[PDB]
Structures are given as C-alpha cells and as structure tokens.
From Swiss-Prot, chains A, B:
One of its GO terms (biological process) is positive regulation of endothelial cell proliferation. It is found in: Secreted. Snake venom VEGFs may contribute to venom dispersion and prey subjugation by inducing vascular permeability and hypotension. This protein induces angiogenesis probably through VEGF receptor (KDR/VEGFR-2) signaling, as well as drastic hypotension. The hypotension is mediated by nitric oxide, which is produced by VEGF-activated endothelium NO synthase. May also induce vascular permeability. The keyword Disulfide bond applies. It comes from Daboia russelii (Russel's viper). Homodimer; disulfide-linked. Interacts with VEGF receptor-2 (KDR) with high affinity, but not with VEGF receptor-1 (Flt-1), VEGF receptor-3 (FLT4), and neuropilin-1 (NRP1). Expressed by the venom gland. Its main location: secreted. This is Snake venom vascular endothelial growth factor toxin VR-1.
Amino acid sequence: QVRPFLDVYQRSACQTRETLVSILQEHPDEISDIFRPSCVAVLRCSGCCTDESMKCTPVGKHTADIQIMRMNPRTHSSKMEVMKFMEHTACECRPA
Amino acid sequence: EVRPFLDVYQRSACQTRETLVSILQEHPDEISDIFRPSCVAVLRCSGCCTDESMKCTPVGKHTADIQIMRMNPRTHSSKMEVMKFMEHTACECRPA
C-alpha cells in the first residue's frame, strides 16, 4: 500500500515524539550504579521544517516521573525507584 | 503520575520504531529537486539491550512506498510521486 501524502506529513512534521535517552546521559551525576533499562522513552521535539534554515524547537517542557531499576554493580542488588526526566511538551520550527 | 516499570521496559526495548530519515540520506542521488516533506518516518531498529555489550540490530528488512511531493526548482512544477524507503522488519540484540 502506498502511504498517502497526508499520512506522511502527519508523521514528518515538527512535533513531540517518543525519543530514547540514556539514563547515565540525562543524569551525569549518577556515576555509581547501573540502571535497568539503561534508557527510557520520553517525548522530545523532532521533525523536518520547511527548510534547513529552520529547526524543530521545544517551546515548552515538563518533568516526568519514571520508575526504573537501580542495580548496585558491587553487590548486584537491584531495586525499583522513581527517577525524574525532562520531557518536551510543545514544539515549533524556529530559525535557530 | 509515575510511569510504571513494565511500561518503561516495553518502550525502551530493542525493537523497530518510528525513525525520521531525510530523503537525501535515503536517496543521496536526489540532489536537484526539493521534496515536501523533506524527511519521512520509517520503522528502524533501536533500543537499549539489557546486555550493554549488545546493540539493537535489524534481522530483516522490507520496503515501504511513500507518497511525496517533488518540487522542480527549474521548471517550478511540483507533483506527487511514490518513493520507496527501507524499513526494518525485526531486531535482535547482538554483540557489536
């Protein structure tokens, strides 16, 4: 089936979409333990704008609370815990 | 509202997911015309393997026909046309 033009723009457009981020990357301050999973999916702005002169930019954000598993690499002890992650809420193509 | 673990895992796992690819990166030879949209969303493998020494890799590929607008900067015409893109059918965590 050919994916119709409107269905194409619907997904290509600048907007918030599921984006994988590394826990250790988002929290560089976390440098003693392992996390499972090691990455989480959160909304981030992405999509192609009218031209490369513009970039899909976040104009709003918030903090999501996500449950993950903290694994102590030294004792192999792991336990559920809630960690905060930054998430984009609104997007717009901007000059940048 | 905390995001429950099982849900966090379901999304973070290595699997095929919506991925933005520019028409130029998927069709490097298409350098003369302008496309609307200039990028498309297609299924590609990504995710964080439980085993950190593993990388999320495609184990099957297929194609998708997508309708796009081609704008000719010389003739100034712009019409619809079907363009094919590669997608990942399935993935697996493999050392790499």
